[PDB]
């Protein structure tokens, strides 16, 4: 839904739409060249179909051309400083593609707001949405937006014939929460099957590998996913059906 | 507690056998929800 989608927000504020119950493939994607740049960090594309999924989150917003590179880990820059901070780990995909047939108003697309001033260069995934004058410098700036102080957020005014360096892109970013819990958004498989006492490679959503599987004489906590060996290997799992 | 924009809550229920004390026993504490909410927390109060 959110890709062939209607209306997208700013960058300092956005719409984390947690998604559940899905069977996502993402191979409906990374084959539609309508994605401009698609660079992934925790996972490589065409591989994010296998087992790596527990309540991922989405991120929709809009920005002009050059700004896409700023969104990677690190990559310091105004949008990444006061407007949208990306952590240094587990970052998943980054979808960038053109937002020009829905944007770039004739006189300018005046409705895309970036925080021009803010102390404390953004914390990871921080949403500072409130718009108070910066109070910059030793000065009263108290509803006055006066000297040394003015509106924290500004527009871009993209034009329908605007420049490619500033042609505006609609950017999607997917976070990925790994393995902690019952999974939710798997990749097509099921094998409808389960067998014991036989060397078989396994993919019980929480790991891959090969072994011999027995109904175990040990009790777990209900919420609790699965054990682990002192060897930091999978002691046992809970079959999500059985 | 809050780390990396989340929020976590934990629970336990042992009986009460004191009036003006706090039990010098121990029991573990178990996860409740890994609340993923983008807020800063510095002040907090209870509800009676």
């Amino acid at each position: 839904e959110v890709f062939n989608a209607t209306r997208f927000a700013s960058v300092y504020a956005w719409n984390r739409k947690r998604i559940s119950n899905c069977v996502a493939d993402y191979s409906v994607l990374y084959n539609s060249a309508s994605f401009s740049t698609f660079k992934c960090y925790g996972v490589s594309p065409t591989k994010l179909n296998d087992l790596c999924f527990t309540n991922v989150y989405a991120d929709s917003f809009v920005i002009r051309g050059d700004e896409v590179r700023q969104i990677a880990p690190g990559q310091t820059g105004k949008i990444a400083d006061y407007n949208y901070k990306l952590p240094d780990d587990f970052t998943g995909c980054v979808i960038a593609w053109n937002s020009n047939n829905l944007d770039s108003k004739v006189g300018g697309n005046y409705n895309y707001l970036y925080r021009l001033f803010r102390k404390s260069n953004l914390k990871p995934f921080e949403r500072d949405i409130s718009t108070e004058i910066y109070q910059a410098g030793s000065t009263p700036c108290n509803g006055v937006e006066g000297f040394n102080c003015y509106f924290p957020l500004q527009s871009y005014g993209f034009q329908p014939t605007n420049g490619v360096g500033y042609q505006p892109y609609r950017v999607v970013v997917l976070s990925f929460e790994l393995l902690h819990a019952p999974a939710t958004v798997c990749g097509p498989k099921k094998s409808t099957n389960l067998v014991k006492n036989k060397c078989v490679n396994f993919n019980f959503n929480g790991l891959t590998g090969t072994g011999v599987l027995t109904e175990s004489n040990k009790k777990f906590l209900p919420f609790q996913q699965f054990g682990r060996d002192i060897a930091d290997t999978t002691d046992a799992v809970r079959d999500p059906q059985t | 507690k809050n780390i990396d924009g989340y929020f976590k809550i934990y629970s336990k229920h042992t009986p009460i056998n004191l009036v003006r004390d706090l039990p010098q026993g121990f029991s573990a504490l178990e996860p409740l929800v890994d609340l993923p909410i983008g807020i800063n927390i510095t002040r907090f109060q209870t509800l009676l």
Binding site: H180, A181, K218, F220, L221, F223, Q224, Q225, F226, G227, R228, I230, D235, A236 | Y10, D21, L22, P23, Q24, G25, F26, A28, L29, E30, P31
Partner: peptide, 23 residues
Amino acid sequence: AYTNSFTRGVYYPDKVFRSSVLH
């Protein structure tokens, strides 16, 4: 009113089971 919190407060670090192993 100040009392001494003796040893309460230990909480599960995460949702990964382990068995009879110190950690």
